Amino acid sequence: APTLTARLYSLLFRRTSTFALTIVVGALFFERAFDQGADAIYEHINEGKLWKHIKHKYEN
Amino acid sequence: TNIRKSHPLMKIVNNAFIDLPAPSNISSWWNFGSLLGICLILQILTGLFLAMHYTSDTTTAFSSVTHICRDVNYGWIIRYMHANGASMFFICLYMHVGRGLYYGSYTFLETWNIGVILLLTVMATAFMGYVLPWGQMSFWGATVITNLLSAIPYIGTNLVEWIWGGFSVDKATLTRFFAFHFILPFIIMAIAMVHLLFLHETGSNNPTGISSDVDKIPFHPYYTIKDILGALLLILALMLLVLFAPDLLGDPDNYTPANPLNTPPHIKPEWYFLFAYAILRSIPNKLGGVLALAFSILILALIPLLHTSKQRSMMFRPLSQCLFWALVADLLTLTWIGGQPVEHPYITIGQLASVLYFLLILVLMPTAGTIENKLLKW
Amino acid sequence: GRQFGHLTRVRHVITYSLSPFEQRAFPHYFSKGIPNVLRRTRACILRVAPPFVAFYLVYTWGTQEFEKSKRKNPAAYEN
Amino acid sequence: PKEEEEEEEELVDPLTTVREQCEQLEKCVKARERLELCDERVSSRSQTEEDCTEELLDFLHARDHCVAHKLFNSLK
Amino acid sequence: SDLELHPPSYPWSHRGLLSSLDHTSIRRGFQVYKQVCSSCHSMDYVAYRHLVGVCYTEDEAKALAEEVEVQDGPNEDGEMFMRPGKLSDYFPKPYPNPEAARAANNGALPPDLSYIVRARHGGEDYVFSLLTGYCEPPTGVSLREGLYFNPYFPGQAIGMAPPIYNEVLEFDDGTPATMSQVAKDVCTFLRWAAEPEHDHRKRMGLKMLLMMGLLLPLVYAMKRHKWSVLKSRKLAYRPPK
Ligand code: HEM
Ligand code: HEM
Ligand code: HEM
Ligand SMILES: CCCCCC[C@H]1C(=O)O[C@H](C)[C@H](NC(=O)c2cccc(NC=O)c2O)C(=O)O[C@@H](C)[C@@H]1OC(=O)C(C)C
């Protein structure tokens, strides 16, 4: 049982190929998860949105 | 053989930031050269995106900007990055010149001088820049200033109307300024390269003013990454404004269109001309005021002729070190006064600060230098 | 332009160095860091600070007198 | 109950209830008594003289300050 | 007249750093604009569609747009009739010629409202204070006709009638139209009529801080790595003899 960082280096960081592949694969998932958590944090500290305002106007 | 060295193009790039030997020694005060570069391109870059939506014509001028801010997808960040980047371009320009005096960098005549040419041009550019939205400050800002050439004996009148396209500021004046505000940053960008050309002839000065030939490091790693971090810091600041305090450095009244009938008792050029503004009106003269305003900047080109010290940097010069800060604070004074109305305390103190400025650079620092020589037995 | 190899003449100096992957990027960041910035601050307060408080004193007194010049103006006008 | 109803659609405003409550503390009664002293003073010699804009403004500063501090908790 | 006073710090729901506007409060504000200000105050830059994402909804915006009649494009005979209300066009209202604003309100220009919060020092608070400020002239003093009194005003001699307390309403669901409640809402809307981007701006600003919060340390640890070779380098001078 080596180290996380060790195993990480061997399988993905060593070759500049996989190294770069890792970051483009890692950026896609990051943009998504960071935008979720972020906006959520932005809403949680607010709530005078147009989100909770809609419930009132589904009609016309 | 390494193509990175023999290819006509790369050579230049190798010489610019890869193999160029630099002092193992420079510190943060040397970052503002990249920052000014970054500033210049980012300015050119947002500036261009605004031009695909801006207009000119006095009727639509103001309207287009608001169009951008409200209607143009993302036009607001672009507009505000442009306007805030403009201020940052001054903070750095200011810091750069600062670094320069303190450390004696000005001993590279050609380089220093190109830098003065670089100063006047970005000043001349940014001036035209704010006339564009056609706000209140834009109109009289564009009026109070330009006029100054009317103080020039015998022909002042002719020139000010020639630069105007009429008898006042209108039609002919906004289109003119837009076009000039468009072509200048390109010309500046060229001059910058010549600035940088002459700089490579000697390599960089450093915090000690000694000479680092005995200890140079490659721009590769070292100053490329120390330029990246640095640029990130410049982004933090520019974004702090744009995204949290968009109008903090902006005069709220360049909102509300023009009006050759009005003039709102206050009016000052953008912050970065305040020290200069203060100088000019701290003189009861049309000719003297503008003459003094000119000297206020054109004196940089005089500094090297008054280097008196046997050491280059002020790193080991307490006396001058004191007069340096007195200069900075005093400029911070002029900036503050410039920002105030021409009334009671404010007049006499801004009048003293002016004299100080010129007496400090023209008599005090040069003498501090000689005394230090004498103290050291030099 | 000037390249390495044509810079200048150096006599007898040895320079030992170490791989970045073999050392810490932040040796004693705080342990040795703080003490040093105290030391550099101390070393320079006296030449940097004074002109700024001078401006500081002139700034607060300056606005003071600006208000007390007009607002305070009346004052007395008794008849 | 029913008397308070007419009181609503005909009166009521959180600004006045607060103004009067703020017009009460130290700096205010003092800034009003500097203002009343001058009020009497210029309408005493009720003819041919100066102004009194000044003493009013100092009162409104001190009030409107503490006005802003609590006021907004009542609104909606 | 030469002396002046500046506004206090009303704790707006959007004064804090990452603080969104109150969309419910932007609504009531538009109402205050339409019923009251709109018959004197031009608002050349905002439009009914601008309201769509903000406060109202699709159909609602259409309806409010239809409650006026604007002069549409000319037709075949070179006409220029009138039409219900789209969504497209703005709120160009009160007067044609600018001097016609002067002919109505005695020689005074009620300036555009899109401006306002960013064209006057203090922003919302100056407009909030100027509206709920309205006080009575003490001694000395004068006035021409009805050049009303206001302390929060340059010179104190305005030409604007105090159209505050005239309790108008339609605060759907139930909201007391008191002077102060009415002033907060106009301002809150006026903030949004000047800086619509306001909330997105700060949303990004959060990400900007949050991003830089990971990057600054990182791009800094990177530079350390590379400079560490230089930082721990050891010199020895070994001259002959
Ligand atoms: C278009 C605006 C300018 C740009 C883009 C620019 C760019 C640069 C760059 C990249 C450097 C090398 C890095 C550094 O030392 O920071 C530099 C150094 C220098 N510049 Fe500028 N600069 C500009 C304005 C100025 C000004 C205002 C001056 C002084 C009037 C100036 C005179 C110098 C001098 C003397 C140096 C040498 C600094 C040293 O060796 O320590 N340039 N500049
Ligand atoms: C050649 C690239 C540039 C272009 C295409 C450009 C074009 C424009 C346009 C169309 C405007 C009016 C829109 C607006 O005000 O937001 C503007 C405003 C301005 N830009 Fe530029 N400009 C460029 C480079 C610069 C430079 C080098 C500076 C100096 C830092 C500069 C500083 C300004 C200033 C001060 C304003 C007006 C201030 C304000 O927005 O309130 N821009 N520019
Ligand atoms: C809540 C609705 C209204 C608001 C928020 C409003 C707000 C304002 C503001 C902020 C100013 C300029 C203040 C300054 O220069 O610093 C102004 C000027 C004026 N508006 Fe209004 N107003 C409203 C309704 C009216 C109405 C109903 C009238 C018709 C009596 C009116 C006629 C004026 C006039 C005559 C001025 C000129 C004041 C002057 O510059 O001398 N406005 N208004
Ligand atoms: C397009 C980007 C490629 C770069 C080529 C052009 C840019 C260029 O030439 O790059 C190098 C990086 C040039 N010098 C430095 O940065 C620099 C020099 C000594 C020390 C430091 N830092 C810390 O000690 C530096 O940062 C510098 O920073 O000058 C810019 C103004 C120029 O930029 C310009 O010309 C403009 C006219 C484009």
Q: What is the CATH number of the domain that holds C31?
A: 1.20.5.210
**Is residue D76 classed as helix, strand or coil in its secondary structure?**
coil
Q: How many domains does chain D have?
A: 1
Tell me if D18 sits within 8 A of D66, measured CB to CB.
no
CA-to-CA distance for B106 and B312, rounded, in angstroms? 9
CA-to-CA distance for E186 and D75, rounded, in angstroms? 13
**Is residue B341 classed as helix, strand or coil in its secondary structure?**
coil
Ramachandran quadrant class, E85 (left: phi over 0; alpha: psi -120 to 50; beta: rest) = left
B22 membership: H or E segment, kind and range:
strand B21-23
Task: Please calculate the CA angle E190-E191-E193 and round it to the nearest 5 degrees.
Answer: 60
Q: For residue B226, indicate whether it is catalytic.
A: yes
All domains in chain A, ordered by first residue = 1-60 (1.20.5.260)
From the CB of B300, is ligand 1 less than 6 Å away? yes
The closest CB to that of D52, out of E7, E140, E175, belongs to E140
Pull the structure tokens for residue E64: 């409010």
For residue D39, give the CATH number of its domain. Answer: 1.10.287.20
Instruction: Provide the CB-side half-sphere exposure for E219 (13 A, CA).
Output: 18
Tell me if E17 sits within 8 A of E199, measured CB to CB.
no
Tally of CB atoms within 10 A around C26:
11
Task: Please calculate the CA angle B2-B3-B5 and round it to the nearest 5 degrees.
Answer: 80
The experimental method, as deposited, was X-ray
Q: Which chains contact A through at least 3 pairs of Cβ atoms less than 8 Å apart?
A: E
Q: For residue B204, indicate whether it is catalytic.
A: yes
Quote the minimal CA–CA distance from E1 to chain C in Å: 11
- Which residue has the CA at smallest separation from atom 5 of ligand 4? B16
Question: What is the amino acid identity at position E96?
Answer: P
Q: Hunting for tokens 């969504």 — which residue is that?
A: E87
Q: How far is CA E77 from CA B72, B250, E71, E73, in A?
A: 35, 49, 15, 11
Q: What is the 3-state secondary structure (H, E, C) of chain C?
A: CCCCCCCCCCCCEEEECCCHHHCCCCCCCCCCHHHHHHHHHHHHHHHHHHHHHHHHHHHHHHHHHHHHHHCCCCCCCCC
From the CB of B191, is ligand 4 less than 6 Å away? no
Instruction: Provide the CB-side half-sphere exposure for A56 (13 A, CA).
Output: 12
Give, as one character, the DSSP assignment of residue B201.
T
Q: How far is CA A38 from CA A34, C59, E202, E208, in A?
A: 6, 43, 12, 11
Indicate the length of chain E as a whole number.
Answer: 241
All domains in chain E, ordered by first residue = 1-196 (1.10.760.10), 197-241 (1.20.5.100)
Chain breaks in chain B (C to N over 2.5 A) after: none
Burial class from Cβ neighbours inside 10 Å (0-12, 13-18, 19+) for residue E176 reads middle
Pull the structure tokens for residue A11: 């399988």
B225 membership: H or E segment, kind and range:
helix B222-244
Strands (E), chain E: 43-47, 90-91, 234-237
- Which residue has the CA at smallest separation from atom 10 of ligand 1? B33
Beta partners for residue B22, in sequence order: B217
Q: Residue D72: its chain E contacts at CB < 8 A?
A: 10-12, 184
Q: Which chains contact C through at least 3 pairs of Cβ atoms less than 8 Å apart?
A: B, D, E
Question: What is the amino acid identity at position A33?
Answer: A
Q: Hunting for tokens 């030992």 — which residue is that?
A: C16
**Is residue B135 classed as helix, strand or coil in its secondary structure?**
strand
Tell me if B185 sits within 8 A of B327, measured CB to CB.
no
Interchain contact, B330 vs C4, CB within 8 Å: no
Tally of CB atoms within 10 A around B35:
22
Tell me if B46 sits within 8 A of B82, measured CB to CB.
yes
Tally of CB atoms within 10 A around A48:
19
Can you state the percent helix, strand and coil of chain E, rounding each to 5? 40, 5, 50
Tally of CB atoms within 10 A around E184:
27
**Is residue E91 classed as helix, strand or coil in its secondary structure?**
strand
CA-to-CA distance for E190 and E181, rounded, in angstroms? 14
Instruction: Provide the CB-side half-sphere exposure for B167 (13 A, CA).
Output: 0
- Which residue has the CA at smallest separation from atom 16 of ligand 2? B79
CA-to-CA distance for E216 and B145, rounded, in angstroms? 41
B266 annotated binding-site participant = no
Cis peptide before A20 (omega within 30 of 0): no
CA-to-CA distance for B181 and B128, rounded, in angstroms? 6
Residues 6 or more apart in contact with residue B201 via CB below 8 angstroms: B110, C1
B344 annotated binding-site participant = no
CA-to-CA distance for E45 and E55, rounded, in angstroms? 17
Q: For residue B200, indicate whether it is catalytic.
A: yes
Gyration radius of chain D's alpha carbons: 17
Pull the structure tokens for residue B49: 């995106």
Pull the structure tokens for residue B30: 């040397």
Q: Residue E124: its chain D contacts at CB < 8 A?
A: none
Give, as one character, the DSSP assignment of residue E13.
T
Q: Residue E18: its chain A contacts at CB < 8 A?
A: 42, 45
Give, as one character, the DSSP assignment of residue E70.
B
Tell me if E30 sits within 8 A of E189, measured CB to CB.
yes
Q: Hunting for tokens 């909030």 — which residue is that?
A: E128
Task: Please calculate the CA angle B21-B24-B25 and round it to the nearest 5 degrees.
Answer: 125
Pull the structure tokens for residue E77: 């005979």
Pull the structure tokens for residue B132: 């564009």
Q: How far is CA C63 from CA B347, D21, E123, in A?
A: 12, 33, 23
CA-to-CA distance for B312 and B202, rounded, in angstroms? 15
Q: Hunting for tokens 């709102």 — which residue is that?
A: B264
Tell me if B290 sits within 8 A of B301, measured CB to CB.
no
Q: How many domains does chain C have?
A: 1
Helix and strand numbers, DSSP H then E, in chain E:
7, 3
For residue B261, give the CATH number of its domain. Answer: 1.20.810.10
Give, as one character, the DSSP assignment of residue E16.
S
Quote the minimal CA–CA distance from E121 to chain D in Å: 17
Q: Hunting for tokens 């339409």 — which residue is that?
A: E34
Tell me if B12 sits within 8 A of B208, measured CB to CB.
no
Counting from 1 in the atom list of ligand 3, the atom nearest the Cα of E109 is: 37
Closest CA to D67 of D32, D23, D33: D23
Q: How far is CA E168 from the centre of its chain?
A: 21
From the CB of B43, is ligand 4 less than 6 Å away? no
- The CA dihedral of E67, E71, E75, E79, to the nearest 10 degrees, is 120
CA-to-CA distance for B131 and B313, rounded, in angstroms? 40
The answer to whether E121 faces chain B, any CB pair under 8 Å, is yes
| Pairing status of strand E234-237 against strand C13-16 | antiparallel
Q: How many domains does chain B have?
A: 1
Domain around D18: 1-76
Instruction: Provide the CB-side half-sphere exposure for C78 (13 A, CA).
Output: 4
Pull the structure tokens for residue B180: 């000039």
Domain around B113: 1-378
| Pairing status of strand E90-91 against strand E43-47 | antiparallel
Pull the structure tokens for residue E233: 């380098």
From the CB of B196, is ligand 4 less than 6 Å away? yes
Domain around C37: 1-79
Closest CA to E198 of E10, E8, E18: E18
Tell me if E90 sits within 8 A of E46, measured CB to CB.
yes
From the CB of B269, is ligand 2 less than 6 Å away? no
Pull the structure tokens for residue B257: 């269109």
Burial class from Cβ neighbours inside 10 Å (0-12, 13-18, 19+) for residue C43 reads exposed
Question: Which ligand approaches the C-alpha of residue B34 most closely?
Answer: 4
The closest CB to that of E20, out of A38, A48, A57, belongs to A48
Burial class from Cβ neighbours inside 10 Å (0-12, 13-18, 19+) for residue E42 reads buried
Tell me if B86 sits within 8 A of B40, measured CB to CB.
no
Pull the structure tokens for residue B273: 């001309």
Task: Please calculate the CA angle D26-D42-C63 and round it to the nearest 5 degrees.
Answer: 60
Evaluate the CA torsion angle B223, B229, B230, B234 in order and state its sign: positive
Active-site entry in B34, B87, B212, B270:
B270
Beta partners for residue C15, in sequence order: E235
Which pairs from B65-73 meet CB under 8 Å and 24+ separation? B65/B132, B65/B133, B66/E45, B66/E114, B69/E197, B70/E45, B70/E50, B70/E196
E135 annotated binding-site participant = no
From the CB of B35, is ligand 1 less than 6 Å away? no
Residues of D in CB contact (< 8 Å) with C are: 49-51, 54
Pull the structure tokens for residue B175: 């289109």
Q: How far is the CA of B81 from the centre of ligand 2 (A)?
A: 10
**What is the widest separation between alpha-carbon atoms in chain D?**
54
Closest CA to B42 of B11, B76, B88, B95: B88
Interchain contact, D50 vs C77, CB within 8 Å: yes
Residues 6 or more apart in contact with residue A36 via CB below 8 angstroms: none
CA-to-CA distance for B35 and B345, rounded, in angstroms? 38
Interchain contact, E223 vs B225, CB within 8 Å: yes
Pull the structure tokens for residue E109: 């220009």
Closest CA to B231 of B35, B9, B1: B35
Quote the minimal CA–CA distance from B264 to chain E in Å: 11
Tell me if B43 sits within 8 A of B87, measured CB to CB.
no
Counting from 1 in the atom list of ligand 2, the atom nearest the Cα of B131 is: 37
